[PDB]
Structures are given as structure tokens and as C-alpha cells.
């Protein structure tokens with residue numbers, strides 16, 4: 267059965283490689299939320315968060 | 321001696337707070353993961369030091 | 372103010388004459404003791 | 420899978436319970452029968468055998 | 469032998485390289501920067517506590533606050549502050565709150581929810597460009613409505629007409645209405661949404677109308693799209709229960725579905741597909757024509773149509789020299805396309821039964837008589853004779 271048999275296992279390993287590839291990919295995504303005009307919002311941001319006002 | 325330390329050990333962890341159980345819905349790149357606790361809301365919470 | 376409010380249950384089901392399972396009206400089932408200020412000759416299943 | 424006891428503050432398993440309580444009752448009246456004269460031993464024994 | 473090797477030549481080297489490339493790059497990303505971006509990140513982590521309670525943004529009041537409704541029972545007037553903008557948010561989007569004192573500390577969700585996860589799919593379609601024959605005509609009607617605006621919008625503009633919105637596939641079971649929609653979706657290379665209409669409904673109340681909103685909300689972000697809400701029958705006219713625990717749920721959920729389909733605008737860029745057993749398991753008016761064009765009634769393969777389905781199957785199984793193609797058709801009388809596939813599965817089991825490696829003449833003949841026997845009526849020719 268050598269024409270299809272050998273080539274069957276070879277098919278299978280590629281699919282498994284592709285599944286593994288997707289779990290490597292999704293564990294790192296695009297950085298972060300940091301934006302220079304809302305880094306200036308941070309100055310006021312520490313005080314209100316720690317305070318009793320919201 | 322081993323028998324007394326272990327009973328104290330059983331007792332110790334009961335005094336420590338409870339534990340829970342969720343399932344990860346998605347992965348975050350801030351070094352966090354998004355967990356959905358089974359009777360409760362979603363939380364993005366820091367991960368264990370061993371994983 | 373010093374009396375302090377109380378919670379009601381109903382005896383869900385006898386488990387011992389020492390320990391009794393109550394069904395809380397507040398919610399969850401509990402196993403609770405008994406005191407010497409209640410008669411356990413008059414606790415019986417389904418008594419409030 | 421069965422009933423079990425958890426402590427209230429620990430919220431951890433410290434004791435175990437029968438599964439025979441926490442369900443519905445085993446006998447709705449008294450476990451021993453009310454009639455002790457009987458009208459089952461006296462009345463249709465043949466059918467009762 | 470030679471061409472399955474050629475598939476291996478293309479897939480092994482390119483794919484294996486791709487895994488390895490990702491894996492080094494995850495390290496490599498880090499190395500270009502060493503200040504500025506690192507710093508900003510560092511203070512984002514000081515600000516945002518651990519854990520974060522989820523929120524849902526109801527609405528933004530323009531003054532550096534907002535109102536959220538959260539899985540925490542009381543609502544909150546939260547503030548918009550720290551690494552978030554007023555215009556980085558839109559209403560109805562999912563937000564991240566600070567555990568201690570609720571504040572929108574940014575978004576990393578943007579309509580990330582479990583019902584979204586079921587709905588989006590990364591799966592491969594089962595059929596690609598009508599792999600299995602029969603129903604040639606019906607696909608040249610789905611395609612006119614659904615595929616054709618996406619591929620060429622220009623042609624509708626010369627015509628001066630508005631372009632269609634949605635299709636309704638209905639009628640017979642075993643005719644592969646649910647598979648033609650999958651075919652059409654692969655042909656275009658559109659975004660496909662396998663959500664099922666029955667997966668919004670649960671005993672517990674009041675959850676459902678959120679779910680109906682989220683479908684239309686996500687579909688528009690990733691537009692162009694094809695949305696398939698499969699099995700919208702169950703949420704039809706019918707009731708959950710005749711006692712309790714569901715008197716409301718079906719009623720709110722359906723109504724809420726019609727509303728956000730129309731409310732988009734009359735678009736020809738987000739199509740919907742309603743798959744349903746009949747219009748007798750739904751309400752008598754839907755939403756209700758001029759707006760939902762076109763309606764496709766599936767009925768049973770005819771002698772031409774069922775030939776076509778059959779020829780596909782028989783060639784993928786050993787022999788056809790034994791019993792002519794025509795002789796299979798002749799023996800069969802008209803039935804759905806499942807009954808045609810069923811005869812071939814049974815034929816194959818019969819070759820196993822004998823312990824042959826050929827589908828012999830005897831196997832074909834028995835397999836044909838079996839299916840006809842299920843699935844039987846004889847009072848068509850009994851009234852007559």
C-alpha cells in the first residue's frame with residue numbers, strides 16, 4: 267500500500283504542525299494600549315484611582 | 321512528629337482562603353490570560369509563576 | 372438594639388438529634404447545631 | 420458524586436455526610452406501619468401469600 | 469503517486485518554515501526598543517491592578533465619565549481615564565475595569581465574548597464550489613443575490629437598482645441547503661459566521677437580547693461578511709414551555725433579531741442567511757418582502773439532478789463496470805440527495821459483509837432496495853390500482 271500509506275502519515279504531520287503553529291501565534295498579540303496623548307492623562311490618573319471619588 | 325506536622329498542615333490550608341476554577345477563553349499579551357469563572361464574570365488576572 | 376436580629380429557616384430534614392439540616396430562607400442549605408434555648412423534643416421535620 | 424460537608428468560613432471539605440439525607444424522605448409516615456392488629460394478615464391471606 | 473508528492477513539496481517546506489519563523493520572531497520583536505514604549509507599558513501595569521473585573525459600556529457621557537453595566541449587580545458611573553481615549557471607545561463595546569475603584573483603563577477586547585467565539589469559525593468549508601453535483605439552478609440564484617454584490621457592485625449601479633440583502637433557504641431535509649451556503653462562502657473568500665440561532669436560547673432569562681445585538685455588531689466590524697444564522701425555526705412563532713421558565717425568552721429574542729437586520733440600512737454588503745425547515749415553523753410575516761430577497765424552495769432531485777449526485781459517489785468507490793450508471797437510476801425512484809448517499813454507504817458495508825475489495829453487482833442491487841423500504845408509500849399506486 268506504499269503509494270498512499272506513506273503519503274498518508276506525511277499529510278497528517280503537516281496538519282498537526284499547522285495546529286501547533288496557531289497556538290504559538292496567538293500567545294503573543296499586538297502591544298499594548300499605550301498612546302502618547304493618554305500618557306499625560308496618567309498624571310491625574312493615579313490620584314483619582316487611589317482616592318475615594320469613584 | 322511527621323503525623324502532627326501534617327494535621328497542622330491540613331488545618332493551615334483550611335484557614336487559608338478558598339480556591340476556584342474557570343476556563344480560559346482567550347490569551348492577552350500583557351502577560352495575562354482571560355479566564356471565565358463558571359458561576360461568575362470574566363476576569364483578566366495574572367498568571368502563576370510556573371507557567 | 373442589643374437583642375440583635377435573627378434569620379429564619381425551616382428544618383429541611385433531620386440528620387441527627389444533635390445536628391439538623393435547615394433550608395435557609397436567605398438561600399443555601401446549612402447544617403446547624405441546636406442550643407439549650409430551643410427544645411429538640413419540638414424540633415421535627417418541616418418545623419419552622 | 421454525593422453530598423459532602425464544607426466548613427462555612429474555609430469553604431473546604433472537613434467532613435462527609437450520608438447521601439440519604441439532603442434528598443426527599445424515605446418514609447412519609449412512620450417507618451413501622453400504623454395497623455398492628457392488621458387487616459392484611461386477617462384479610463386476604465391467600466392473596467398475600 | 470507523483471502529484472500527492474507535489475502537494476507535499478509545496479506544503480512541507482513553506483508551512484514548516486512558517487512555524488519556525490514565528491518562534492524566533494517572538495524573541496526578535498523585543499530587541500529593537502529599550503525605552504519609551506517599555507516605560508509606558510511599565511506604568512500601564514502599575515495603574516492596572518490584578519485582577520480586572522469585566523465591564524460592558526452602556527454609554528459615554530462627554531465630560532470624562534461614562535456609565536457601565538457590569539456582571540456586578542449595581543451599575544457604576546465610571547470615569548474614562550488613563551491610556552484610553554473618549555474616541556477609542558464606542559458604545560456597546562466591552563471595556564476593562566479596575567477592581568478597587570471601577571474606571572475604564574482601556575479596551576483589549578472590542579466585542580470579544582464567548583458567543584462571538586462560537587460564531588466566528590476558522591474551519592475549512594466542507595464543499596468548495598459545488599463539489600457534489602445536483603442543484604445547479606438553485607445555486608445560480610443564491611449567487612445572484614449574495615456573491616454577485618460582493619464580487620461586482622458596479623453592475624447594479626448601471627442598472628440603477630438597489631442591491632439585494634439576504635436569502636432564505638427552506639423546504640426539504642437531505643438536499644444540502646446548509647452545504648450550498650458553505651460552498652458560496654468559500655467561492656467568494658468571505659467571512660463566514662456559523663452561528664446557530666438555537667444557541668442564544670437558554671432557561672435563564674434576560675440573557676438573550678444581548679446575543680442578538682452582538683451578532684449584528686461583530687458582522688459589521690469584519691464586513692464584508694456572510695452571516696448564516698442556521699435553524700431560526702426553533703425561535704419562531706412557537707413557545708418554550710406552556711408552564712413557565714421561558715414565556716418571555718422566544719418573544720424578545722425573535723423581535724430583537726428582525727430589528728437590527730433592517731436597522732443597519734438596506735445593505736448589500738452584509739448578507740444574512742436564514743436556514744429554516746419551513747415558514748410554518750416561523751411567524752407568517754417575517755420582515756417581510758422587498759428586503760429579504762430572495763426565497764429559495766428546495767424540493768427533491770429529479771432524474772437529471774439525482775444522476776449528477778450519484779456519479780460523484782460511485783467513482784470514488786471500487787468498480788462501475790459491473791452495473792451501468794443508468795441501471796442505478798432506473799431502479800431508484802425520486803428521493804432527496806441523502807437517500808442517494810445512503811445507498812452508496814450501505815453498498816460499501818455490503819462489500820465488507822462479503823469481504824470483498826470490490827463493490828460487486830450483488831452489493832449495488834441490495835443497497836438500492838434497502839433505502840426504498842424506509843421511506844415508503846404505495847397508496848399512490850393503490851388509489852390508482
Ligand SMILES: Nc1ncnc2c1ncn2[C@@H]1O[C@H](COP(=O)(O)OP(=O)(O)OP(=O)(O)O)[C@@H](O)[C@H]1O
Nearest residue numbers: 600601602603641642643644645646647805806809
Ligand atoms: N447541490 C448540492 N449541494 C450539496 N450536497 C448536495 C447537493 N445536492 C444534493 N446533495 C446531497 O445531499 C446530501 C444531504 O445533505 P444534508 O444532509 O446536509 O442536508 P440539509 O438539507 O442541509 O439538512 P437538515 O434539515 O438535516 O439540517 C449531501 O450529502 C449530498 O449527498
Ligand SMILES: [Mg+2]
Nearest residue numbers: 645646647743
Ligand atoms: Mg441543514
